[PDB]
């Protein structure tokens, strides 16, 4: 069905919250995937856990990774001078590490963050993020407390302020908007989107309801539509990096074993 070459699939670190950063690359390996990305929110609290910027530089090479982005900083969208010293501690771990890009995620508190500050916010960060060369990447949240749930919208304000960055699509995001698809398809600038994030939901409840905590891997059961969402990138042309990134606390649960049949049968879900 979809030709999606294989090199295009990045493992996120959250499916696997057990793991040590080398035994997660290992296993990265082991499935012949060459794409992971990072995480300042692990058990850990660190990006590089207890290891320094070396060892994860020399880790992601002895096991032929490349580290395509840090997860994340919030707000990005309410840019004190807390957020800032936070951004630049999260930009040394970027570069530290040779990742490309770090993640942008916007205010979530049910709180309005007006276009101008965000558009603000996007020139003094892209500013900032040219000074480690490391890319940004704006991910709206779909919540209905987001101050930030179109990707649509947040590809408008990129282009306002004049800025390098690009969007980040997550599906379960997409999803929660649910306004979502009135423009998508003649709205959303496929160039324009830096990458792709995929998990599934099986969870029947309404979609107002749903947190992060539903996140899974694709299945058949899936609610949210990812081989359709992805079928839609393919057909408009999107040729980059999907990343898997599921949140449920089901995962702990989960083997390393267990964690490479779930990345098997999700890509293979994709390709069939
Ligand atoms: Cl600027
Ligand atoms: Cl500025
Ligand atoms: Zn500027
Ligand atoms: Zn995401």
Redesign the pocket.
């Known amino acids: 069905g979809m030709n999606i070459e294989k090199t295009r699939f990045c493992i996120?670190r959250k499916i696997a919250p057990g793991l040590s950063i080398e035994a997660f690359f290992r296993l990265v390996k082991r499935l012949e995937f060459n794409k992971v990305e990072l995480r300042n929110d692990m058990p850990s609290g660190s990006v590089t856990d207890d290891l320094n910027y070396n060892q994860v530089r020399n880790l992601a090479e002895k096991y032929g990774l490349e580290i395509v982005t840090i997860?994340?900083v919030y707000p990005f969208n309410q840019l004190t001078e807390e957020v800032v010293k936070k951004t630049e501690g999260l930009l040394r771990d970027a570069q530290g590490v040779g990742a490309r890009a770090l993640?942008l995620c916007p205010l979530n508190d049910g709180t309005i963050v007006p276009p101008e500050v965000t558009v603000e916010a996007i020139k003094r960060l892209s500013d900032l993020f040219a000074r480690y060369d490391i890319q940004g990447l704006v991910?709206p949240l779909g919540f209905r407390v987001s101050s930030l749930r179109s990707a649509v919208w947040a590809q408008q304000l990129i282009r306002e302020a004049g800025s390098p960055f690009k969007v980040?699509l997550?599906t379960?995001?997409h999803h929660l908007y649910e306004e979502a698809e009135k423009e998508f398809a003649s709205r959303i600038d496929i160039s324009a989107i830096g990458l792709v994030?995929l998990?599934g939901v099986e969870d029947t409840r309404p979609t107002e309801a749903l947190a992060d905590e539903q996140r899974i891997m694709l299945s058949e059961k899936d609610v949210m539509q990812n081989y359709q969402q992805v079928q839609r990138l393919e057909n408009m042309g999107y040729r980059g990096i999907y990343?898997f990134?599921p949140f449920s606390s089901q995962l702990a649960s989960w083997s390393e074993a267990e964690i490479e049949e779930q990345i098997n049968r999700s890509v293979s879900l994709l390709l069939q």
Do not use: G, M, W
């Open positions: 996120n997860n994340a993640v991910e980040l997550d379960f995001h994030h998990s990343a990134e």
